[PDB]
């Protein structure tokens, strides 16, 4: 079914984007709180276009079961950043990377052409990974870094209490996702860009 | 036939037009719905032209059969810009870029010249690359930019049971027309001269990329 095909067509491009130095040193402890911090930054960046990409879509009725709002990670992580940062400082200095521009420019596209198929590719991209290898980076940076969980929220979802049970129901609502073949190409060609836009903003936060 | 001799005679410009950054680009899946729309508006001014050209010709009483008027695009086309940008507004927005300029103008010239020949090389390189071509570049713009179907009109021919048939109607229309050779010459140029014109739009929507 999809959730298969969807793996096995982004194979590649999430291989790539999970290798990337800069996560890759993150994850291993070569880095430190502040390029945690930094990746935070950006992610709230895209997490925002993000969610409301996601608000447009579910709103339309297009595949409103994954589109769970307990999901939603923007509130979350600004609280995170207050804490990393001692303060809203960091609204109004932090600044969009060229390649979070570029993901931002396609979660706006998305959200404006209500592209149902294209946001679900980026949903199950980001969410899928936090509720995955999120979970390593919040375990990681707590023993790597000494950040107090309490910056780690974003890695926390409330009123999901079993990870496994919520990743294979979520799998099997994409297999039983209605989509024309043109819809469900466009959702496979998205999940891979998904995939590159990742490993671009993974790769200007090592420059 | 004459079917034959426009695809020797084009090739070369025709393998420019189809080879444009802008239109590999595009067919590849890195530009975004915004520059599909911006090529249908392109589109949507010189097939106005094109088709006011094809009226006049066809009043006139030149190669009839061959222009059909099913074949007819621009109103469609409005219809997808009306669903592409949202609301009417792009009617009062858009330009001519300086190639659709140059193309309107020789469109418009045929038209005030009522000149047959050079309208059915015109005919025969739109209408045709939109049958023969029109479904990959309607499949693309799904693919890769998630495109509501029902704003895809343009590559639909309401008219036409079966694309295959139809062409091959076409072709042998080209064949049958009743030409001078002073006008065969004049149409198989304006036909390379058609290919140019859209070569040169594309090469317009691809600046600053």
Redesign the interface.
Known sequence: GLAVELKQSTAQAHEKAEHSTFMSDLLKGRLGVAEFTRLQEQAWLFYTALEQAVDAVRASGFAESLLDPALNRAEVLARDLDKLNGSSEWRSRITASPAVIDYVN?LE??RD?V????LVAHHYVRYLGDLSGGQVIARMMQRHYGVDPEALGFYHFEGIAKLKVYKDEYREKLNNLEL?D??R??LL??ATDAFVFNHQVFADLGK
Not at 115 to 118: F, K, L, N, T
């Open positions: 396609r596209e998305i052409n592209d149902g198929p294209a024309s043109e819809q190409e466009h060609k998205e």
